[PDB]
Amino acid sequence: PAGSERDYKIAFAIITALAFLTRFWGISHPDQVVFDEVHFGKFASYYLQRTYFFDVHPPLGKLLFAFMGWLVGYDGHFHFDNIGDPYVINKVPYVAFRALPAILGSLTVSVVFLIMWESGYSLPACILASGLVLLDNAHIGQTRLILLDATLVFAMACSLLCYIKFYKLRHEPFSRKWWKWLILTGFALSCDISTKYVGLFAFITIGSAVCIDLWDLLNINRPKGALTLPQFGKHFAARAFGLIFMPFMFYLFWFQVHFSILTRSGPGDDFMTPEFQETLSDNIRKVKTLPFLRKWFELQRSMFWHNNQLTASHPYASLPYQWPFLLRGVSFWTNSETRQQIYFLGNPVGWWIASSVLAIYVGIVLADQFSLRRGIDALDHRTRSRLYNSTGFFFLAWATHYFPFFVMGRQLFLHHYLPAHLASTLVTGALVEFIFSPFAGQSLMGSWIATAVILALVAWSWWFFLPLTYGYPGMSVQQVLRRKWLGYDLHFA
Amino acid sequence: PAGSERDYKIAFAIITALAFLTRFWGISHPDQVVFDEVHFGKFASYYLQRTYFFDVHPPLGKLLFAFMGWLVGYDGHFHFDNIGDPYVINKVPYVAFRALPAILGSLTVSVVFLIMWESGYSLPACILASGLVLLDNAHIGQTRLILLDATLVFAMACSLLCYIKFYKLRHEPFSRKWWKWLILTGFALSCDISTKYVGLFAFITIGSAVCIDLWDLLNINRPKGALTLPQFGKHFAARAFGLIFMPFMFYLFWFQVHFSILTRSGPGDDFMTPEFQETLSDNIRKVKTLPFLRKWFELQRSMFWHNNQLTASHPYASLPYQWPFLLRGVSFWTNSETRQQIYFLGNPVGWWIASSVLAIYVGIVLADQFSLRRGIDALDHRTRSRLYNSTGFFFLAWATHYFPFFVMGRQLFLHHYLPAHLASTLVTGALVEFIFSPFAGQSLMGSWIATAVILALVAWSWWFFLPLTYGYPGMSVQQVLRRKWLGYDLHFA
Ligand SMILES: CC/C(C)=C\CC/C(C)=C\CC/C(C)=C\CC/C(C)=C\CC/C(C)=C/CC[C@H](C)CCOP(=O)(O)O[C@@H]1O[C@H](CO)[C@@H](O)[C@H](O)[C@@H]1O
Ligand SMILES: CC/C(C)=C\CC/C(C)=C\CC/C(C)=C\CC/C(C)=C\CC/C(C)=C/CC[C@H](C)CCOP(=O)(O)O[C@@H]1O[C@H](CO)[C@@H](O)[C@H](O)[C@@H]1O
Ligand SMILES: CC/C(C)=C\CC/C(C)=C\CC/C(C)=C\CC/C(C)=C\CC/C(C)=C\CC/C(C)=C\CC/C(C)=C/CC[C@H](C)CCOP(=O)(O)O
Ligand SMILES: CC/C(C)=C\CC/C(C)=C\CC/C(C)=C\CC/C(C)=C\CC/C(C)=C\CC/C(C)=C\CC/C(C)=C/CC[C@H](C)CCOP(=O)(O)O
């Protein structure tokens, strides 16, 4: 083919259209309460009736679900109670609830394409990364239900894109665009941490990327001039204000909204001290008013303590070492009359290729450093910097979203690897531009064939496991056997 | 005072004498089976009657206990069964069993002094490190029982000393002394890993110290000449042979001894496949012979699998974050008639000072690097290199023996921090030579007063908690209250 801005735009539009198609196709088929739709639907409904409740997660995801429900006009009283009850016979708009994660997943694919486009890679690399995210069964299966992991993944991708936009403005510090993208990176990180607490890992990524930059900004002998200590102080203050203080303010604002919406007694009042019982205006009596900081501190301590002790066992808990190569998958919902399972797992071909390319990138960096120690360059200036500045950045994200799961010893599931795997899909694309590289990009035919073959193979693998992702077509017993690759408990054999 | 080789020798002799005094004083007082003397005494006895058994730990520690028992001549049939039965009314030499860990603890204090002496520090620094190890209640309490953690700590200290000896010979590579100390470092690491599997962490330390060295040996532009690739290949081959292959050979040799000693049926035969039942010569019948590698592989796989699933709950399991500052301690043995407890905990003053000095060293390194980035040296060549080569090495050991406990999520106890705390006692001494430094060592009076004050305070703290370490003097209820500093469950209040 060829390469031009028009081709970039055409590819981006097609990728976004196919993302919206795949995430929304058959979104209402399970039409029943599924693996963890129970809790989050309960909390979204409690938001709608303004009755107070208690949860261990930060509120923003359930606020988004409640906003989607409120937009339709549903208030109702169908607070979910058990896995396996029909939504349609209860006059509840579950499709409206499920449309938000689908929109966020489609926007996640678009943001992946935007990250690869903004970093400066060629069209085949952006297409490959966006297609690996597009044709992934785990991302599709997570953006299908009432689950707040899609919001987490979208916020992490948005933070990566915002920081890439901001870093390219390093030549015009303290300008309007500079401050705008700094604040936007902070806001994306704030949303990421206000969805789930594991979003803190994104703060590590953008943290590390900042620190290195600050180190580069602290060198007294650097090619781009030198900064006096007050100027570096201004830079550090700007980073701290835009990346630490604004995220905390947005987090606090989301709890302020949570407290303002909930002004009625409900299930979860007893977790608070009697003054908080007094301030809920127990209805369906006198009510007091407390300062916001006191209520926030009490709720935060209680939430941390309950997350420290209130753990419910699940048979499909996984360990971090099983994630990058898909050694085991989780099952969400199944009924025996139609022989339909919704067993949640990634795309085995895509995940294996992405992890293998992670290993190849590690080996390439090691070989380049070893050759440099001998005094051999072997890399152009442009191809070195990118491989350490852009691709390395992506490899940073993966690491910062994968390794911290070994330190945590509570229950973890495969979907916890969805953010990190996202970054894995980026380096892959970069490494296809790298090894098959002859603005110099004449005869991208090599990378074009590489990405075409890899994406066709991943597409075949996604087509193979598509029923298990959707659960619409009832599959025969021998067809269930064909999906038993690495010991997947499909329980229909 | 003054400084000279005679003063070094006098201090070393006094430190060793006091170590042997403190570790052996009242060694037979508990005169009863205690917290984990059960299992290890059982296995040492089974070694003595040559009856086969199964354990999850590598055999070397129980081989040492069985050798100590065999030296006296005891064979008997007193395989331990429950916590809290009298040794003396059963004609068993428990004092002989307990003398080995006491000897190893005294030698550990001596080896700490030797490490500080060989590295080049002044007398007050060596005295401070050796005294912090000497006046530590946790090290004393671990080298008191039939427990194989003292062997682990002694082997780690010996590996550190052996590698310091070897590295000083870097100017005469491939000589007899060079190879001798390389093999000795490998053998010390082999003993460390053949006692308990956590000894692998020492392989990290000496691993890292080697890697940096190899990096320095790989630089094509380095002050001390340049090595062609074959010469660096010879260096890497020597490191791999002395640090990887010899340790594995010694580990295999210890299993060979274990298999040769055990040629009778016993408790633990059923964990093996029927061929291994056939090779045990079931007595108290035909017996076959298997190749050693097959038996070793079967036993190793079974041991790993049982350690992966066979966990027994304990009420005093701790987490790594509680260790450096002694937030909680474990109780081993107690009887209510004499009001005697043997609650195991470190020396709070010594541990707090050691951890605080770890933090101070981190801050000092950070400040030095930050000042260097501005282009300010602020450190002499001699004082820089030491702080990064010797003291840093010690800080490496601590890290490599502490952080890997967060990755592991099984049950961990406070004694697991005994190796790492050892390295913490080294940096402390170094930092007392560092900050109070005016061969230039005129007027060490500052460091002399510093170490005198710190060691007097630690000695008072050790005297305060000495009954809880020994359990000989029955303490009153109000005296139990005085030891309730950071919430220690003494259960005699
Ligand atoms: C086990 C260890 C292993 C295997 C791997 C370790 C991980 C590794 C390798 C690295 C860790 C991560 C690293 C190093 C950095 C992450 C954070 C950083 C530094 C940045 C954040 C990412 C981020 C937005 C990077 C921005 C990159 C954008 C696309 C650059 C825009 O083009 P741009 O003009 O600057 O290119 C060049 O600009 C030069 C100007 O000077 C010029 O000279 C050249 O001609 C050329 O124009
Ligand atoms: C969060 C991060 C923080 C806070 C800390 C990070 C950890 C840090 C700071 C460091 C990590 C560990 C490091 C850097 C190294 C560990 C392993 C290494 C390199 C060695 C193993 C330890 C080890 C046996 C070191 C041996 C040191 C012996 C005592 C040196 C003997 O005296 P010697 O003549 O060589 O001194 C000088 O020899 C020069 C010759 O050139 C000469 O010029 C000088 O005049 C002067 O005679
Ligand atoms: C001086 C700075 C330097 C050197 C350089 C500049 C660095 C820079 C400019 C930016 C990044 C700075 C860095 C490295 C960190 C900053 C983030 C931080 C510590 C705070 C800011 C984040 C916030 C706005 C709110 C944090 C919420 C609070 C209050 C607590 C959370 C507790 C968490 C998150 C517990 C994680 C486990 C979780 C329980 C598992 C369950 O999991 P789940 O809920 O999913 O089931
Ligand atoms: C190429 C090399 C480079 C780059 C540079 C040169 C590096 C160099 C020269 C030296 C060091 C090399 C390094 C970094 C590692 C080498 C060690 C290694 C992996 C093997 C050698 C060690 C052996 C002789 C035997 C190992 C026993 C075996 C077979 C398995 C054990 C399993 C372990 C240990 C499981 C740890 C958890 C434990 C279960 C907790 C329970 O705990 P507990 O039992 O206490 O209750």
Residue numbers in the entry:
A (entry chain B), B (entry chain A): 49 to 332, 541 to 694, 729 to 783
Question: Which sentences from the paper describe this structure?
Answer:
Protein O-mannosyltransferases (PMTs) are conserved endoplasmic reticulum membrane-embedded enzymes responsible for the transfer of mannose from dolichol phosphate-mannose (Dol-P-Man) to serine/threonine-rich protein substrates or unfolded proteins.
Structural analysis by single-particle cryo-electron microscopy (cryo-EM) confirmed ctPmt4 is a homodimer, allowing processing of the data with either no symmetry (C1) or two-fold rotational symmetry (C2) imposed. Within the membrane region, the 3.2 Å C2 map showed the same features as the 3.4 Å C1 map but at higher resolution, and was therefore used to build a two-fold symmetric model for the ctPmt4 transmembrane domains (TMDs). The 11 TMDs of ctPmt4 have a highly similar arrangement to those of scPmt1 and scPmt2, superimposing with a root-mean-square deviation (RMSD) of 1.6 Å and 1.4 Å respectively. Moreover, the ctPmt4 homodimer adopts the same overall morphology within the membrane region as the scPmt1-Pmt2 heterodimer, with a rhombic cavity separating the dimer halves. As in scPmt1-Pmt2, residues at the cytosolic ends of TMD6 (W263 and L266) and TMD8 (R629 and R630) form the major dimer interface, bounding the rhombic cavity on two sides at the cytosolic side of the membrane. However, the luminal ends of TMD9 from each dimer half are tilted further towards each other, resulting in an additional single constriction point at F662 and V663 and a smaller rhombic cavity than for scPmt1-Pmt2. Strikingly, we found that Dol-P-Man is a good fit for the lipid density in the cytosolic binding pocket, with the phosphate group being stabilised by positively charged residues (R218, R638 and R642) and the mannose group by histidine side chains (H219 and H637).
